[PDB]
Amino acid sequence: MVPISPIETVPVKLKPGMDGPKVKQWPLTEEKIKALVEICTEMEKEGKISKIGPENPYNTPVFAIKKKDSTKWRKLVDFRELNKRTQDFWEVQLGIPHPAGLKKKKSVTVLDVGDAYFSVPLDEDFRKYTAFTIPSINNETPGIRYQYNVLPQGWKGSPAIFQSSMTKILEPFAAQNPDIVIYQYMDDLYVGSDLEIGQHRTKIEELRQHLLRWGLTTPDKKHQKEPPFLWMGYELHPDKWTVQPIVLPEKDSWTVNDIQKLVGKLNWASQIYPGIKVRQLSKLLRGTKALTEVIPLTEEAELELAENREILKEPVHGVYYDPSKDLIAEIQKQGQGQWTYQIYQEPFKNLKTGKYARMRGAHTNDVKQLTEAVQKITTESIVIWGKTPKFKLPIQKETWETWWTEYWQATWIPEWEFVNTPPLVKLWYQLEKEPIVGAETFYVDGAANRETKLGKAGYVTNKGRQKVVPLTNTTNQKTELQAIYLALQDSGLEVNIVTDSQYALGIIQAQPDKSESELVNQIIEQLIKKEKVYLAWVPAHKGIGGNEQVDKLVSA
Amino acid sequence: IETVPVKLKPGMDGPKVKQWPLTEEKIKALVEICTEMEKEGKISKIGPENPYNTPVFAIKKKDSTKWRKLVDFRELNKRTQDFWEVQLGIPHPAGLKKKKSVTVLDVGDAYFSVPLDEDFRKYTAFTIPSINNETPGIRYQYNVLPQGWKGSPAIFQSSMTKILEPFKKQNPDIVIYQYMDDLYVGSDLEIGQHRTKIEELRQHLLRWGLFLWMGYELHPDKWTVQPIVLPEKDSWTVNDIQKLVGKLNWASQIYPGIKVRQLSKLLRGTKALTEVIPLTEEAELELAENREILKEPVHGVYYDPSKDLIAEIQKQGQGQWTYQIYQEPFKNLKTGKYARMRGAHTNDVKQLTEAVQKITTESIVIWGKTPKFKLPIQKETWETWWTEYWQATWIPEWEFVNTPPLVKLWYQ
Ligand SMILES: Cc1cc(/C=C/C#N)cc(C)c1Nc1ccnc(Nc2ccc(C#N)cc2)n1
Ligand SMILES: Cn1ncc(C(=O)O)c1-c1ccccc1
Ligand SMILES: [Mg+2]
């Protein structure tokens, strides 16, 4: 015998207050029982499970299933109840690597470690909770009782415990061989390197020898699995990567389900196919949530779809990460709240692409959206590469300086340079910091009856210009904006506007360039046409002439 | 030695807080730091049967070139029991904020000398992530009192008291106050004398069993406030008077007897914003009466130690920031303004992060706890960047203001 090192068990507990499962084993056909007895006899000989006495009070149901197109049976132990009762574990499989963060490798070898998985020992004190029962022929003897000695397939803790155990075994090999990478996925180890090929295979043999110390055997035959690897919806090649084939179906009519699937594919595709858009197609999923409902595609959605088909006409690949070079991220505005981006190191060789969509909200502007997109790409890049890329943005340096210095919030974007690629993000208006000499002063107000929704909006000016308009289906807040609109509409190129509307100020001080409100949009269009606008706020009902005059006019 | 038993509050599990993305330089720094800590027995590797997590990152304190591990125990601290067993409580010293100099020491390293209760260790789990999640995150827990944890100064308190005993007895007028990993040491000595006493104090700690060498110097007796003040002008435009009436209206929520009747009457008619308006005598009297009211303290203002402190900050432009700390609206306990610089002349978010730290420091010195911030910044911008500029060993709580406050005008 060659001594092997035992794998240390991970101590396991049920959730506080909970006991183990006690679930009835339902009858099986005579055929299934003979099959299970045979299966379990082999497992028992291999040390995976053990017969137990009548004292153990727990139970998990066992089943026998036909794979398909065979005479063979397989055992299935249904651990659903035990899983509900088993403690949570640390899950490492959360956060899978992005292909764009990987490094190119000359060689990648796959090693089968299937013998390891079904051979990690289970915490002795926990084994009792895994008890199951093969029913007896004709139910005339006690059913055969077994419990697990190893991590059972389908039990809550098996993946975490297998991963942690394998990692611990591999750790010294990885540490003392910094010229290879090792990655564990399901049943296999993947080993990559840039070594001269003879040296690479030597490393593989050394790894096999290392694993042998725990009794882990790997098949003598060299793996059939070789690059390219189909993995987590990607294709990995030695020196490039892509998403698995994206094929958009032809359909004469589309349902909720079809569109959700369309968008999923588009979203998946957008990490390497530049320019993918999903705004119009996503709009069709607004509300709804009735799966079989057919929705007509708007002309807009049709155009978006056709634009995507073109983008997806031929394969595109990303390159891997070279740590010795800067990462560069470039962003374009696409319209309707949509932004697209590319991250590269060498010109014309993307590591990945992506998109960002405007957050829901009544009012917004391009600079805020660009800023949000920058933060999102920054955070993604920290995840993937551990560093912020240098940005190329379609906004002039002077425009940014004016924006951030005058904006009421703190705001920042990291190191960036202007790229002159239309459409450029710009400031559409900026309000005056001081009242304008020689500009007419409009005192505005509005009011509405909250019952009838009848209102009035209007203004009076220092030149005696006046206007009041009677309105239906309005509200006090809406009349306040309506009044400001009228003052903008009726004034010359420079204008001072005095309002008591905290609501209106709150919106305008937010500097929107676009809004869901047609009225706010019209106000924005008016501001864009002015040379100078000063907006002054006063408290309501304070005897502030101009303001009180117009408040009275618009009241009733 | 021989642990103090600790528990979480009843009916709550340990923290399960996601580790946020770390830069390569911070990951490398943390790997190096934790390898050493593990060798020294301060932390140990843990297994998958521990599902808890608390975020970790790394900072560089003021005037230092080496990384410091910073654990964000905000969640664990909420979930940890309050400590009333060994001690009844330690009243906050009102004299600390009165000293000519207060120096802040990092004494967190002393905590590592006391073992952490074996049954509690699991709740201190943390992860060093890998770039692109290519290798499993490195999982550890503490074996000793961790820096940043609420329980550490509480459990180390009897040890700290013995250490400082001969320094306190020898220097009876020096105020020493401990908050988390910080020790605050105040004196009225000349700066050179003060400095030698600090170094004197350090040696006591160095003498015992072992960023301590550092010193963050404050001068709370010079700290200033912002009363409400009104312009003094020889000519008032319609606009100036509107601004005045608006500021007074706002002030009248804080101060009872403020009047604007007479001033509001000045603009009678619908006048050009830039037209100059002479003040009437009635309006002048009213303004004068208002000025006098504003020179008095606000009525019914008191600190309640059972209530949160709230801190609001406004961006005033040109690197200027105003702030107010309060518990009830319009009852400000402290107001202030930083017109200052440091770095960050082209970086709003660095400026704001420095402001948050200075305000938190003031809060600790005055009331012995941190305020809950209302920050004038989008959540995503703050969350992406604040850790890059953080230099303190504690972290306060914060929320985000998305609507521009109209009152920024009046703190300007
Ligand atoms: C995440 C990962 C998945 C697989 C495989 C998963 C599967 N199936 C294989 C490996 C070796 C890794 N780990 C790493 C780590 C750093 N660089 C790389 N680069 C890299 C990996 C594969 C190919 C190829 N062909 C090229 C480069 N891989
Ligand atoms: C110009 N515009 N655009 C939308 C609206 C509206 O009331 O919704 C208006 C408006 C209508 C009446 C008075 C003022 C504005
Ligand atoms: Mg009104």
CSV table of C-alpha atoms in Angstrom, one decimal, chain B residues 5-8 76 79-81 116-124 141-142 149:
chain,number,residue,atom,x,y,z
B,5,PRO,CA,-18.3,35.8,25.6
B,6,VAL,CA,-20.0,37.8,22.8
B,7,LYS,CA,-23.3,37.3,21.0
B,8,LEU,CA,-25.3,38.9,18.3
B,76,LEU,CA,-21.8,43.3,12.0
B,79,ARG,CA,-26.0,43.0,14.6
B,80,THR,CA,-23.7,42.8,17.6
B,81,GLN,CA,-25.1,43.0,21.1
B,116,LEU,CA,-11.8,36.7,20.2
B,117,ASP,CA,-14.5,34.4,21.6
B,118,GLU,CA,-14.3,31.1,19.7
B,119,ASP,CA,-18.0,30.9,19.1
B,120,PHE,CA,-18.1,34.4,17.7
B,121,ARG,CA,-15.1,34.3,15.3
B,122,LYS,CA,-17.2,32.9,12.4
B,123,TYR,CA,-19.1,36.2,12.2
B,124,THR,CA,-15.9,38.1,11.3
B,141,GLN,CA,-11.9,34.9,10.0
B,142,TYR,CA,-10.4,36.7,13.0
B,149,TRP,CA,-15.5,46.1,15.3
